[PDB]
Ligand binder design. Structure first.
Ligand code: MG
Ligand code: MG
Ligand code: ZN
Lengths: 51, 132, 220, 328, 63
C-alpha cells in the first residue's frame, strides 16, 4: 500500500499532515480504500484515526 | 537479380564507402583495382601465388588491427617488395599503432621472405560516399 | 525600447491615420462598375445580404456597403504595410495577371499570380526554403481559380492565421475571408481601381513610416 | 582452415536470419591473450621508472584472475541485457492507450514545448492489399497533446514502423490545438449533450470533490486539458477516433458566462447550495444591462434525456453504476 | 505551433485564445491591428448549405 510499503509512516490521530491526505478536502469525508489503494487493515486504522 | 558484391538499398539511412557503393560491373570503369601485380598480364607466371598471398594479407590486416580498419586494403607489388596501404580509423593511441607497424612489417617480411613496406593513412571517420 | 512602442502604438489611436477617406467615393466605385454582379443564377448563397437587388436577372452589389467594407480593408492593408510586413496579392484571373504583378512590384509588395503549388503556405519550409517568413497579409483580387472553386490560398491563409482581404463577387464565398470587399472582380475598370487603391494605401503607409522614423531620429 | 573462416558481420547476418546480436568486440583489449604475454606497447605502458620494459609473461594465477575478470564481465553484460525489461503501463498491460509518449518535438522556429504531455489514445494494426507484396502492414496511432492549461489537440499518424508513427502523430498534433474554456479552471461550463456520427457524448458539470468520471479515453484527454471534474457517459459506437473528435467539438461548442451575459444583456448569478441563498454574481453584461425581466414559464420546453430523468427518480438500478473505483 | 483548424472559429478567436493559453509566445502583427479596427463580421466558417422546400432568397428585384 502507500501506507505500509513505507514503514516510517505512522498512522495515529496525531499527525494531521498524514491524515489530511486521506480525507476529501472539500467534502470532508474519508475515502473508501479503493479510491486510495490502502489495505483494509490500514483503512480501518485510518478511519478510527481520523475520528 | 545479381547479388554479387553489392550493397542493398536501405530505408536510405545506411552509410556507404565509395567502394562498396560501386557494383562489380563498374570495375575499370569508375572503381579501380584493389591490388596490383604483374601476374595476370599475357606472358606471365605465378599469378596464383600473389592471389593466395593477397588473400592472406586481407585476413591478416583485418585481424592484427581490430575494429580500426576503414576501407578494403590496398596491396601493391613492386620489384619484389610489397607496399601495403591501409585506410585506418583513429581509435588506438599512437604507441600501439607503431607497435603494430613494426610487428606487421617484421612478421610478414619473414613470412613471405621478401621486404614489406607498410603505410597507414589515418581517417577521423569512415568516408561516406552515399546516403547518410 | 520605449520609443519603438510609441512609434507602433501611436497610429492606432487615430481612425484616419493614413487619410484614405479621400481615395474613393461611391461615385468613384460607381464608375468603376463595382456595382455589377453575375446573373441571379450564378449567385452564391452568402452574398444574399451584400446584394442590393436583381435588375432583370443581373445582380447588383450595395455600394454603400462596398465603401464601408473597402474602407476597413484599405485601412487594414495600410496598418500592416506601415508595420513593415509582407503583403501578397493573388489572382488566377488571366486578363489581369500583368496588372497585378505590375502593381505589386511597384509597391515593394509581392504578387503570386500563377499556378499555386499545393502545400505552399501550409508546408512552407519544404517548398520555399529551410526557414522562411510567410505573408503577413494576403490580398485577393479574385477569390477563385479558373475552375471556379475557391482558390486554395483562402483555405490555407485562413488555415495559417494570416488575415485575408479580398474582393467577393456575387458567385464567390466570402465566409473564410477576414476582410471582404463585395464588388465586381470581372470588369477591367474595377480590377484597375482596386489595384491602384491597394497600391496607394501601401505607398502612404510606407511614406508615413519613413517620416515618423525621421522624426524619431530628431527626437533622439 | 584459416582460409575457410570469415568476417564477424557475415556470421551474424547468417546467424540472426533476417532475410539478438552479441558483440565479440567488447571486453578484449589489444595484446590481450590466454598465454598471458605482456607486450611493451599494449598490455603495459611503454616505460616504467626504468625505460623500455622487455617482453614479459604473467603468472599462472595472475592469468586465472584476468580470465575470471573477463568471465565476470560477460556475466555483468548478460545481467545488463536481462534487466532491460521495465515499463510504465498506460491502460492495461500491452494496450498502448494512455501511455505517455513524451513531449513533442521542437519545431523549426526554435519553438519548444516542455509543457505539453502526450498520450496515446489508440494504436492499431492496419492492413492493405499490394499487388506486389500481398498484405501490407501499417501502424496508425491516434494521439492527443495538452499542457493542462486548457489548450490541447490530437492527431492521427501512420507509418510502417510503429516508432515512426508515434513520432508522426506527436508532431502533427501540436499543429491542431483547441482552446478549451474551463469554469473556475476545472469543470466544463454547462452540460453538453452532443451527437456526433453514431456516437453520443453526454457530460455533466460537477462540483470540486468529484474527480473525472469518464470513459478511459476521455479521462486521459481531460487530464491533458486540465479538466479535473467531469461526468461523462458515452452511447453508441465507442470507436476511439469519433470519440475524441466528438469530445473536442463538444468542448469547443461551449458557451461562456460572459457570452451568455452579452447575448442576453443580463446578470448571471450562481446559486451555490453550500452557501445557501447568497446570490453570487459570476458575469455582467459589458455594455447596457437590460431593464427587462425575462419570461418565467410554468412549462419550459426542453429536450429531456430519459436517462437523466430515470436517474432522477431512483430508477437506475445497475449494479455497475455506484461502484467504487480507484482515484481519478 | 498553432491551430490549423479552419472550421473551429475565426482566426481572431484561435489566435487570441492560443495566446491566452500562452502557447503562442509572440503576439502577431495583424492581431493588434485587428483588435484596433475589427471587421463587420468575424471571419467564421460556414457550410454553404443548399436551400430545399419553400425557402427562396431575400433579394428584392429592381423596378
Ligand atoms: Mg540476367
Ligand atoms: Mg499483462
Ligand atoms: Zn497495507
Amino acid at each position: 500500500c502507500p501506507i505500509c510499503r513505507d514503514q516510517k509512516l505512522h498512522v495515529d490521530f496525531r499527525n494531521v499532515k498524514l491524515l489530511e491526505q486521506f480525507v476529501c478536502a472539500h467534502t470532508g469525508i474519508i475515502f473508501h480504500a479503493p479510491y486510495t489503494g490502502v489495505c483494509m487493515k490500514q483503512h480501518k486504522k485510518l478511519t478510527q484515526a481520523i475520528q | 537479380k545479381n547479388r554479387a558484391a553489392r550493397v542493398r538499398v536501405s530505408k536510405g539511412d545506411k552509410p556507404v564507402t565509395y567502394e562498396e557503393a560501386h557494383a562489380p560491373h563498374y570495375i575499370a570503369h569508375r572503381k579501380g583495382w584493389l591490388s596490383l601485380h604483374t601476374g595476370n598480364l599475357d606472358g606471365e607466371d605465378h599469378a596464383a601465388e600473389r592471389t593466395v598471398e593477397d588473400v592472406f594479407l586481407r585476413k591478416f590486416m583485418l585481424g592484427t588491427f581490430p575494429g580500426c580498419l576503414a576501407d578494403q586494403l590496398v596491396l601493391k607489388r613492386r620489384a619484389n617488395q610489397l607496399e601495403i596501404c591501409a585506410l585506418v580509423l583513429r581509435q588506438l593511441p599512437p604507441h600501439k599503432f607503431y607497435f603494430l607497424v613494426g610487428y606487421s612489417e617484421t612478421l610478414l617480411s619473414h613470412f613471405y621472405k621478401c621486404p614489406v613496406h607498410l603505410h597507414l593513412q589515418t581517417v577521423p571517420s569512415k568516408v561516406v560516399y552515399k546516403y547518410i | 525600447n520605449d520609443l519603438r512602442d510609441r512609434i507602433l502604438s501611436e497610429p492606432l489611436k487615430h481612425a484616419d491615420f493614413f487619410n484614405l477617406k479621400e481615395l474613393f467615393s461611391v461615385r468613384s466605385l460607381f464608375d468603376a462598375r463595382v456595382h455589377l454582379g453575375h446573373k441571379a443564377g450564378c449567385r452564391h448563397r452568402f452574398m444574399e445580404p451584400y446584394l442590393f437587388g436583381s435588375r432583370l436577372g443581373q445582380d447588383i452589389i450595395d455600394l454603400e456597403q462596398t465603401a464601408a467594407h473597402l474602407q476597413l480593408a484599405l485601412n487594414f492593408t495600410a496598418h500592416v504595410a506601415y508595420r513593415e510586413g509582407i503583403i501578397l496579392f493573388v489572382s488566377r484571373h488571366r486578363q489581369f495577371a500583368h496588372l497585378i504583378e505590375t502593381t505589386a512590384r511597384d509597391c515593394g509588395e509581392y504578387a503570386h499570380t500563377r499556378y499555386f503549388k499545393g502545400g505552399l503556405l501550409t508546408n512552407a519550409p519544404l517548398l520555399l526554403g529551410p526557414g522562411v517568413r510567410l505573408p503577413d497579409l494576403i490580398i485577393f483580387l479574385h477569390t477563385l481559380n479558373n475552375v471556379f472553386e475557391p482558390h486554395v490560398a483562402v483555405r490555407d491563409a485562413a488555415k495559417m492565421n494570416i488575415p485575408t482581404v479580398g474582393i467577393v463577387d456575387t458567385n464567390c464565398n466570402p465566409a473564410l475571408i477576414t476582410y471582404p470587399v463585395p464588388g465586381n472582380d470581372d470588369s477591367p475598370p474595377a480590377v484597375r481601381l482596386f489595384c491602384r487603391l491597394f497600391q496607394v494605401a501601401i505607398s502612404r503607409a510606407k511614406e508615413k513610416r519613413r517620416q515618423v522614423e525621421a522624426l524619431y531620429r530628431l527626437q533622439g | 582452415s584459416f582460409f575457410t573462416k570469415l568476417t564477424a558481420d557475415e556470421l551474424w547476418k547468417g546467424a540472426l536470419a533476417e532475410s539478438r546480436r552479441k558483440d565479440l568486440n567488447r571486453g578484449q583489449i589489444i595484446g590481450e591473450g590466454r598465454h598471458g604475454f605482456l607486450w611493451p606497447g599494449l598490455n603495459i605502458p611503454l616505460m616504467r621508472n626504468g625505460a623500455v620494459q622487455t617482453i614479459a609473461q604473467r603468472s599462472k594465477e595472475d592469468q586465472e584472475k584476468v580470465e575470471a575478470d573477463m568471465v565476470q564481465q560477460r556475466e555483468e553484460w548478460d545481467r545488463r541485457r536481462k534487466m532491460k525489461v521495465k515499463r510504465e503501463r498506460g491502460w492495461s498491460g500491452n494496450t498502448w492507450g494512455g501511455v505517455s509518449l513524451g513531449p513533442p518535438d521542437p519545431g523549426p522556429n526554435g519553438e519548444t514545448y516542455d509543457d505539453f504531455d502526450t498520450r496515446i489514445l489508440e494504436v492499431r494494426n492496419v492492413f492493405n492489399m499490394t499487388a506486389k507484396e500481398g498484405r501490407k502492414r501499417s501502424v496508425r496511432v491516434l494521439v492527443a497533446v495538452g499542457n493542462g492549461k486548457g489548450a490541447a489537440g490530437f492527431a492521427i499518424g501512420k507509418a510502417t514502423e510503429r516508432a515512426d508513427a508515434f513520432r508522426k502523430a506527436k508532431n502533427r498534433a501540436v499543429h491542431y490545438l483547441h482552446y478549451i474554456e474551463r469554469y473556475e479552471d476545472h469543470t466544463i461550463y454547462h452540460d453538453i449533450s452532443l451527437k456526433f456520427k453514431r456516437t453520443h457524448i453526454k457530460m455533466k458539470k460537477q462540483p470540486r470533490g468529484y474527480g473525472l468520471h469518464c470513459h478511459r479515453a476521455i479521462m486521459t484527454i481531460c487530464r491533458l486539458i486540465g479538466i479535473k471534474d467531469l461526468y461523462a457517459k458515452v452511447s453508441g459506437s465507442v470507436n476511439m477516433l469519433n470519440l475524441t473528435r466528438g469530445l473536442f467539438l463538444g468542448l469547443s461548442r461551449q458557451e461562456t458566462h460572459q457570452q451568455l451575459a452579452d447575448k442576453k444583456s443580463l446578470h448571471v448569478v450562481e446559486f451555490r447550495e453550500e452557501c445557501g441563498p447568497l446570490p453570487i454574481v459570476v458575469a455582467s453584461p459589458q455594455g447596457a444591462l437590460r431593464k427587462d425581466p425575462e419570461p418565467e414559464d410554468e412549462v419550459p420546453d426542453i429536450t429531456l434525456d430519459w436517462e437523466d430523468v430515470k436517474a432522477a427518480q431512483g430508477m437506475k438500478r445497475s449494479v455497475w453504476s455506484g461502484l467504487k473505483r480507484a482515484a481519478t | 505551433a498553432g491551430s490549423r483548424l479552419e472550421t473551429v472559429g475565426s482566426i481572431f478567436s484561435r489566435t487570441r485564445d492560443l495566446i491566452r493559453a500562452g502557447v503562442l509566445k509572440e503576439k502577431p502583427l495583424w492581431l493588434d491591428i485587428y483588435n484596433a479596427f475589427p471587421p463587420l463580421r468575424e471571419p467564421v466558417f460556414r457550410r454553404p448549405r443548399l436551400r430545399y422546400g419553400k425557402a427562396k432568397a431575400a433579394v428584392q428585384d429592381i423596378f
